[PDB]
Ligand binder design. Structure first.
Ligand SMILES: C[S@@](=O)c1cc(-c2cccc(OC(F)(F)F)c2)[nH]c(=O)c1C#N
Length: 186
């Protein structure tokens, strides 16, 4: 089973990942995890971060340019992902494709049924061959550029509402991880 944990920066996705990992292993399931973007590994990720800190001329000004860099990062990992899906019962990704749809649409003031969200699907899942997650779990919290983080949170909820790329669940900060693991388990 492939699971992506999503949400805005500061939402506390890592803690969820760890909580879920323990709940799955308590239920007798092997678990592997990966975090995106892969800063310090993917040159594409690293240029993208660097660009948001004012490096690389006008790169940050294009949403699609940033989106593309983050896609190329995930694509470089596509074989690792598929490998972990064969090697372990449950594979949990801290951020995945939906992050690109949410930050891009937010940025462009578009909704989940808009162009950017559909572009991300075409590029990442169809063209680049990233496998679609079985579940996407939106960690949606009150308090994690504030304008964009709030709007990205909203777009994310919209992705979950439309079933973008697959089934979702939306959860809060105090979700019970054992209950969540039983819900997600085949
Ligand atoms: C690194 S996480 O915040 C992220 C952001 C964007 C993203 C997409 C478009 C524009 C963008 O720039 C900015 F955030 F400034 F809006 C970021 N795309 C991703 O795939 C991931 C991941 N993982």
């Amino acid at each position: 089973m492939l699971i992506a944990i999503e949400g805005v920066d500061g939402a506390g996705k890592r803690t969820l990942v760890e909580k879920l990992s323990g709940a799955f292993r308590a239920a007798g399931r092997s678990v592997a995890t990966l975090a995106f973007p892969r800063y310090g590994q993917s040159v594409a990720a690293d240029i993208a971060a660097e660009a948001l800190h004012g490096e690389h001329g006008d790169l940050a000004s294009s949403v699609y340019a940033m989106a593309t860099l983050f896609a190329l990062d995930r694509a470089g990992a596509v074989h690792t992902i598929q490998g972990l899906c064969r090697g372990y019962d449950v594979v949990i990704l801290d951020r995945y494709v939906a992050s690109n749809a949410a930050y891009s649409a937010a940025r462009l003031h578009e909704n989940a049924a808009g162009k950017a969200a559909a572009w991300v699907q075409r590029i990442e899942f169809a063209r680049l061959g990233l496998p679609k997650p079985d579940w996407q779990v939106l960690l949606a919290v009150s308090a994690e550029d504030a304008e964009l983080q709030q709007r990205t949170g909203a777009v994310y909820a919209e992705l979950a509402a439309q079933g973008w790329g697959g089934r979702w669940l939306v959860v809060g900060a105090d979700v019970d991880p054992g209950r969540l693991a039983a819900t997600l388990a085949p």
